[PDB]
C-alpha cells in the first residue's frame, strides 16, 4: 500500500476509481489522504485479510 504510491496518484485501475480516506499514523494530527486505484483496492482487501473467511 505504501510502495504503490507516487506512480499512481489520483488515477483509477481495473475499473476501480480513486478515493479519499483518513490518516492518523502521524502523532497528534489526523487528516485525510487521497488514495489511488490500487490503494483503494488494497484498502478494501485489507479488511477481508484481517477478519478472515466464511466457508459454506
Amino acid at each position: 500500500h505504501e510502495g504503490v504510491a507516487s506512480s499512481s496518484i489520483g488515477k483509477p485501475f481495473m475499473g476501480v476509481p480513486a478515493s479519499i480516506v483518513n490518516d492518523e499514523s502521524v502523532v497528534g494530527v489526523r487528516a485525510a489522504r487521497p488514495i489511488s486505484g490500487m490503494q483503494n483496492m488494497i484498502q478494501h482487501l485489507s479488511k477481508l485479510y484481517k477478519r478472515g473467511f466464511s466457508y459454506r
Binding site: 489520483g10 476509481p17 480513486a18 479519499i20 494530527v29 487528516a31 487521497p34
Partner: protein
C-alpha cells in the same frame, strides 16, 4: 449572505432536521430568513471528477464557485449524432450554421453518397456553432469560470462539476452512461437573506465559513478533505464566525414524518484536576474528554461546577466511570497526548476533585458501527482489569 457548514445540506431534509440547532445555532423563529442549498449532487459529481483528475486542482477550482448565481450545463451528443438529430426535425438548426450545410441538411434525401454533404461533414466542428465547449479536456478552473460567467455552458462530456446537466437531444443519440441523477429530461429560485451550504467559497466577500467544529472531527470524509485543502491554501482570506455570531446575525432585529433514531449529538468536555487538600486550591492538570453524547449529559445533570469523583470506600463513582466509558478518551491540553487515569489511590497522580469549564465542539455523528451488517452474535476483546464486573 452565504454561510458554509461542514455537513451535507439538502433542501428538504436539512430543513426538516435542526441542522443549525444541531451545530448550536439559536432558534430563528420564522424560517423565511434562511434557505438551504442542496449539494449532494455536487458531492457525487465531485467523486466522479476525482475518478478522472487529481483532488487538489478540482478542489481549488471548486473554491471559486459563486453559489448565488445560477447556471447550467447543456450536454450535446457526438458530432455525427448531432448531424442526424438536425437532419430530423430541421427546426433545431441554429442560425450560426453554414448556409450550404443548412440547405443540404434540408435535402430530405439520402446524403451518404452526395459527397458534398460529406466534405462539409468533415469540415464541420461543434466549436464553430457553440463557443463555450468543455470538450472533455478543459481544466476544472476554466469550467468554473465559464459557469460563473453566463447561464448556459455547452459541453460534450458528462464529467463536469458545479451545476445541473440538461440534455440537448433525445436520449437515443446519446450513448453515454445513464446518470439520470444529474441528467434530466431533454425538454425543460430566489435566494433568502441567508443561504446555508456545504462547500465554502471565496468568490465574494459576503461569504462566511462557520467555525466551532474542529476540522479533525468532521464525520464526512470528502467534506473533511475539502475543508482541509481550503484552510491549508487560503487560510488568510477566510471569514470565520462563531455559532454565537451566526445566531446574532440571524436574530439581530427580530430579537430585542420519519426521523432517524441512530443520529446523536456529541460534545467535547473541558475540565481541570484540582487539589483541595488544604482550604486553598491547586490546579494540577488540564484535560479534555472527547465525544460525549449530550443526552446522557442532560440525564445525569452536569453543569459548570466542582465535583468529587470518588466514593467513601475509595473507588471511582459509577456516573464518572460510565461517562469515561462512553467517551472516546482524554487528552492533555498542554502536551497534546493521550491521558490514562490511575484507578487507585496510590499517591502518584490521584484525581479526587475535578472542575468542569465548558463545552466547545458540537456536531452530529452516527452510532452505527457500519460493520454490523448482518444480525450475528457479538464478541468483544478487552484486556484484564477493565472493571468488567462493574
Amino acid at each position: 449572505a452565504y454561510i458554509a457548514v461542514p455537513a451535507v445540506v439538502d433542501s428538504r431534509s436539512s430543513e426538516a432536521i435542526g441542522l443549525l440547532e444541531s451545530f448550536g445555532v439559536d432558534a430563528g423563529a420564522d424560517a423565511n430568513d434562511v434557505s438551504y442549498q442542496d449539494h449532494d449532487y455536487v458531492l457525487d459529481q465531485l467523486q466522479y471528477m476525482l475518478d478522472g483528475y487529481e483532488a487538489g486542482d478540482v478542489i481549488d477550482a471548486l473554491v471559486h464557485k459563486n453559489w448565488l448565481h445560477h447556471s447550467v450545463y447543456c450536454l450535446l451528443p457526438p458530432k455525427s449524432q448531432l448531424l442526424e438529430y438536425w437532419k430530423s426535425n430541421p427546426s433545431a438548426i441554429p442560425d450560426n450554421v453554414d448556409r450550404r450545410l443548412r440547405k443540404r441538411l434540408m435535402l430530405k434525401k439520402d446524403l451518404r453518397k452526395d459527397d458534398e454533404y460529406n466534405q462539409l461533414a468533415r469540415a464541420f466542428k461543434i466549436s464553430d456553432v457553440y463557443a463555450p465547449l468543455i470538450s472533455s479536456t478543459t481544466s476544472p478552473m476554466t469550467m468554473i469560470q465559464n459557469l460563473n460567467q453566463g447561464e448556459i455552458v455547452y459541453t460534450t462530456t458528462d464529467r463536469v462539476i458545479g451545476a445541473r446537466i440538461l440534455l440537448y437531444a433525445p436520449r437515443k443519440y446519446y450513448a453515454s452512461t445513464l446518470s439520470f441523477t444529474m441528467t434530466k429530461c431533454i425538454i425543460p429560485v430566489p435566494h433568502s437573506r441567508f443561504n446555508v451550504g456545504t462547500f465554502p467559497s471565496i468568490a465574494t466577500p459576503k461569504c462566511f465559513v462557520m467555525s466551532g467544529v474542529d476540522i479533525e472531527s468532521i464525520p464526512n470524509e470528502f467534506i473533511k478533505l475539502f475543508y482541509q485543502r481550503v484552510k491549508s491554501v487560503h487560510a488568510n482570506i477566510l471569514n470565520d464566525i462563531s455559532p454565537q455570531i451566526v445566531s446574532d446575525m440571524i436574530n439581530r432585529k427580530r430579537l430585542r414524518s420519519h426521523v432517524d433514531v441512530y443520529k446523536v449529538d456529541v460534545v467535547d468536555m473541558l475540565f481541570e484536576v484540582v487539589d483541595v487538600a488544604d482550604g486553598l486550591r491547586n490546579v494540577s492538570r488540564k484535560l479534555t474528554m472527547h465525544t460525549v453524547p449530550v443526552c446522557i449529559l442532560e440525564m445525569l445533570g452536569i453543569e459548570i461546577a466542582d465535583y468529587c469523583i470518588r466514593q467513601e470506600d475509595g473507588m471511582l463513582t459509577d456516573w464518572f466511570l460510565l461517562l469515561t466509558m462512553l467517551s472516546d478518551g482524554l487528552t492533555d491540553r498542554r502536551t497534546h497526548c493521550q491521558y490514562l487515569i490511575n484507578p487507585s489511590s496510590v499517591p502518584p497522580d490521584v484525581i479526587l476533585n475535578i472542575s468542569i469549564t465548558g463545552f466547545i465542539n458540537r456536531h452530529t455523528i452516527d452510532v452505527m458501527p457500519d460493520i454490523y451488517d448482518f444480525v450475528k452474535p457479538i464478541g468483544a476483546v478487552l484486556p484484564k482489569g477493565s472493571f468488567k464486573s462493574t
